[PDB]
Amino acid sequence: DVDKYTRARNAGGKKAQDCMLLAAEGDSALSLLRAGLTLGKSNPSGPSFDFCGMISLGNEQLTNNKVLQGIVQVLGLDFNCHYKTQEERAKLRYGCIVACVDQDLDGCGKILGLLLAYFHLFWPQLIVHGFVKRLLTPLIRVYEKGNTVPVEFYYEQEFDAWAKKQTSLANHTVKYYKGLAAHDTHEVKSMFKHFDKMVYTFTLDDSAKELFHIYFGGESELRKRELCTGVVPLTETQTQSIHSVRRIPCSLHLQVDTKAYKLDAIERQIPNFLDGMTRARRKILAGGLKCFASNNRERKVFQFGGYVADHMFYHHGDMSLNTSIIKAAQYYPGSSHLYPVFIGIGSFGSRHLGGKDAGSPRYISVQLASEFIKTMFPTEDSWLLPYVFEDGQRAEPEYYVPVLPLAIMEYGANPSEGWKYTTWARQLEDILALVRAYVDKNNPKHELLHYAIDHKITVLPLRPSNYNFKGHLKRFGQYYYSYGTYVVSEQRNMITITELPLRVPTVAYIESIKKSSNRMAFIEEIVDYSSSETIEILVKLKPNSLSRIMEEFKETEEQNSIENFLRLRNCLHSHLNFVKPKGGIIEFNSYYEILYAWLPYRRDLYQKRLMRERAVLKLRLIMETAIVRYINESADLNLSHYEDEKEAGRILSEHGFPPLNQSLITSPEFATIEELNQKALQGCYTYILSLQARELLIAAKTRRVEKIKKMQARLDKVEQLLQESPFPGASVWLEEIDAVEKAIIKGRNTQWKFH
Amino acid sequence: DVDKYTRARNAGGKKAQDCMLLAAEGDSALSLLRAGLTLGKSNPSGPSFDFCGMISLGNEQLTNNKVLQGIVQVLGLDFNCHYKTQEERAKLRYGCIVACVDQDLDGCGKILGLLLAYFHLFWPQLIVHGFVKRLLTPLIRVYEKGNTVPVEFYYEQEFDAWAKKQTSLANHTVKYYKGLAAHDTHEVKSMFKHFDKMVYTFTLDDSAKELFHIYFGGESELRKRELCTGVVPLTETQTQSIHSVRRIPCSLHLQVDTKAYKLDAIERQIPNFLDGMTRARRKILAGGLKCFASNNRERKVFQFGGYVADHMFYHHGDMSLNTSIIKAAQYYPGSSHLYPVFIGIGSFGSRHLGGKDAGSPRYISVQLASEFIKTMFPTEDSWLLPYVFEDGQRAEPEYYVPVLPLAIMEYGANPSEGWKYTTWARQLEDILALVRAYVDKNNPKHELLHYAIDHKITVLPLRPSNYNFKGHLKRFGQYYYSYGTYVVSEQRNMITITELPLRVPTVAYIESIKKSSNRMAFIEEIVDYSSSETIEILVKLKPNSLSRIMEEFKETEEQNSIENFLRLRNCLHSHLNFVKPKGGIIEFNSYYEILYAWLPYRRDLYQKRLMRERAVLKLRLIMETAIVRYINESADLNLSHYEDEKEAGRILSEHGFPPLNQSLITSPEFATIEELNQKALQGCYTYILSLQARELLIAAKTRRVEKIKKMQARLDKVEQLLQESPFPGASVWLEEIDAVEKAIIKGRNTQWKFH
């Protein structure tokens, strides 16, 4: 077999039942297992090569794979045995096979799930009676400073419960070990001390079998139904039951690990319907917001990609990161981004190659479209979004909620086969009219739009956008078609294609025309004299070929003879599969329902921002009233730093000064509403104990009083902003819509350069 | 026919001589050319498709090259015919061919030099009289915010000469355009407005055929000899002549750009002999120092690579960066780095796979040593090294000069074949003794070693290091051999290998043994029961077979029969090829030559560092004395901060108060001695006007006088530290050597973990 197999000393012998075969995922896991097994030979008594062999991993096609062939060869497994009896199972060369895989979505999920599916399909009785086992390593380890002994959790839920049970984590360092290679040598020896406690068994409950037909079977219909609901994390009772007897039911593993892996794989191609961007593009947008927040100077594409990888935890390949950055910065007729989030200083590609003619990342530079991004992705709303956490560190948000539905007003296609997704940008005017009717409460269609929302029918048009399109858009039999424009000169027997169909690359169109032999039977030659953004394809035909073209290619009342011959028609087939914000997959059938689903999320975000702003304003005015009421009697109490700052708190508590938490009321970063109003109090008097002498003079007092009157006016303004007729925060939504419309118009005027 | 050829309207007709062909390397340059050529009604009478065609640049092999075949087909060139006469030169379909290429050692030199060599080899008469032309786009553009028209320099020397005057850059922005894709649309149209004057014609002067043969011919000895001197940039006179006549000689073009490209390609594999690291490794070290100069917290490999790319201008791929980071963080018996610059938390590989079994960059984390680096690479000297400026921004230094020569005490190899380079680490004790004898001046061999370095003979041993090696290092006459250790038991017929030769991967060695069919005629089986760091490989042989190995593999007075059978000897072949600090390539016959070459550079760096320290200490001393005198007798003129206008400057210049550059003196980053002393007295009086009230009484005067006393003591310590008998700064070098030896000992004791 392969040389990756390290045989145990007693493997296949009289004591083969006591032997176990560790199946590491890759070379790093193999090296870790080797190091642990060899260090166990000297200090402890336990695992070693005497009773532990090592191997590495690498239906109709699952039987010819070399790795499974090697595994079945070493284990001595017989296909036609079914291992029902104990003596039949005793003939195996190893007592059990232990899978040692990384805790991430690659090791657990895809590979562990694949091994479990293979075993269940071929030898289902092996999973029962406890033959297939796994290695459960500490997923999270928290180290207390000056304690040199960590506390370990095998699941994120246990760590979250312990953390919320804890008072503070100032002196605790949390390390996430998603992969086996992340364990240090001392950590590895700590695991191999009680290696016997890290072996978990699979039970193969009744519900597992059907699941094995869903995630890994050839049935691709019920798989989508299973995937369209998101992954539910394991509950605490299930984890406790698993840890009690060290047995993991297969069902739970299939429903959690493999399902999360499949969802992650889908999310890398299909974007969320709230912002129209995938996880990688969300990371890029967040990194651009973080980098150009205060500087906004042009940076090289590779430099910005390095910044994104450093700060936004983009652990994928840098070539994909650079390609996605270029795609986000591309702006041309037929581009995938109608409103790009980045301004591209340099040659970022043209419509002829479909954006593939972009310059190298080391030459072209990128900048943040500050005006458009700020008007569409407000900085205030960024705090209230739910964020993803990579190894306990903040990263890009789970989803962005722009002022207008970005998943609709921009083009989008998935080139990777496996899941169909195609979106054609709708007209900006129609989107603006629809949202303004929904929010304005003064539009005559506002009540009609609400009627259309509660019961699903269409009341306002939603036509495909034709901003950078010089052709025609014809709706025939519920299908939209884009037609390019051409001219014919009979005297020179020549045709000049002036406009290709929507999102059709020039070189791709030319090669498609050239491939068809029948088309070339009349075309003498083709050249491409098109400009950087316009289309001018010069085709010269053979003599007396126009009549032959007319008689051969026939008009179908939709496209004339020339358009059919020149392939100047495109069908706007759109696949509206999107990723739910909670994790699931949702398949729409029209853009109207996409907009109807996006509206409540934006409305709820506006309401949440309004309540958070109201609470923050109340807290700020409370602390300002406290500081001014200390100021006007500073000649009565006279204690800021005159005495020791430990006896002051008694006298400030004897008077009416509530404890407050500075740096939380002064600048709440991500303080959620209930936590913000809970932990704002029970702080300390640093807002009074640690003030400066600058506040002593009356000018500071009058500045404070004008500030407090300003925030009182703002508080009443946001209070009347609430309980509005359509919903709280509708007027501010209308103002943001107007601002983003102005920004879009300005960008369109200056070719998305903004001077 | 040709895939990416856009024919001109008049090409191949009565105006062929007026038609020119633009050759582009990639699709980005083609898109730029298409955008420039299609300015209709804007930039009139400029280039267009009427007289400009386009083509893309996608010794028997040169004949069948598809790109060159397309080019010759387009131009109608004839291989047999020599275009020496004007009448036969008019048969070409284009008047001239223009190369529109980048200016970053790839567009220029690599493929432009290739095109020039092709034309010279096949049609040398074409280059003369003018046929091959190039597009010299503005390399550097200086924009003034109040002028909105840039100043363009086509060479870096011109920009440097301009920057010699116009010193302030008070309101100027410098932009570097190394590639064609870096130009913006307005820049593109401005360039195409003068496209007629942007073209430069090659001349093929004398002494260029020999240069062409050297750089592109099959001969390599003279090509290597050319590369031992480095690239010399064009002088002002040559650039002025080129710009005045708009003709570029081929020789100058070659020696300027293709030599630089070849040197850059070489130095990406061959490291410098001063620090023992290539450009990528030096960038990694500088980025690590920048990242962990303050925190030293462990970071993921991919995050650190992103930081390095963002800050150190590492524009290459991220996989190479991650691999190099892992290699720099690897520490195991046989690893390349005996003293790694990085502490790696996780599994970074093992000796078995030669470091190729490391975990993914997502999981394993890296951090700076912060204890060995601070001693081997002092932070004081980091301000004195020459620095590499990429696109006008600072980057990793030109070369590092460590306290001990790292190119001689670390294993090095070149995985990229094309330039042999192999280094075997010398013993640390021998190197320390040699350097101490050279420096301490008290060693009995000090003057003897000076005589030795003067007469290039060897007087102190330099033996290969055997720190992490349990074998034997034996010298058999002008070569060294490493022998592994084995134990063989005749009973039960097993041979257990306990130590492999130096830098021999375990799995590679096992595979090499396995491929030898004759050796497995006796080997029953091979098992790899080795540990993580020590090797224990079991080889079970066939019964009564040891005598067969005795009679088959014969003793050669160097290898035992078992050693020859198991290939337990390795020859320590050395290839002492390095790159000169100025750019050239140097070859050494022994490690003694490397040490003797590295010593003067380090001695001169100590002298320069001490000189700069003395100068900056004198500057600080005069500024402190000035401020002390001001705080002493300010009552005479004025004691307040109200004098912040020019009146204070005038009243201070009336007395003996010199104007000093406070910012430069208080923190000179890279100010060398000459302009340090030139700009010291060209500052302002801010060193006095920036005195807070705290510093306006005696309580700060005592601190000031204590500071001046301490720095005066440091000043005369530097003073008599100089003029030492061996060289100035000998004791500082000795104590730095002791500190670095202590750090190395601590790292070796802690397995390069430092707890």
Residue numbers in the entry:
A (entry chain B), B (entry chain A): 414 to 471, 496 to 1192
Can I see the authors' text?
The African swine fever virus (ASFV) type II topoisomerase (Topo II), pP1192R, is the only known Topo II expressed by mammalian viruses and is essential for ASFV replication in the host cytoplasm. In ASFV, a functional viral Topo II pP1192R has been identified, encoded by a viral gene conserved in ASFV strains, P1192R. pP1192R is detectable at an intermediate to late stage of ASFV infection, mainly within the cytoplasmic virus factory, and has been confirmed to be important for ASFV replication. Topo IIAs exhibit a 2-fold symmetry and comprise two functional domains: an ATPase domain and a DNA binding/cleavage domain. The mechanism of enzymatic action involves the opening and closing of three gate-like dimeric interfaces, which are called the N-, DNA- and C-gate, respectively, upon ATP binding and hydrolysis and DNA cleavage that introduces a double-strand break in the DNA (G-segment) trapped in the DNA-gate for transport of another DNA strand (T-segment).
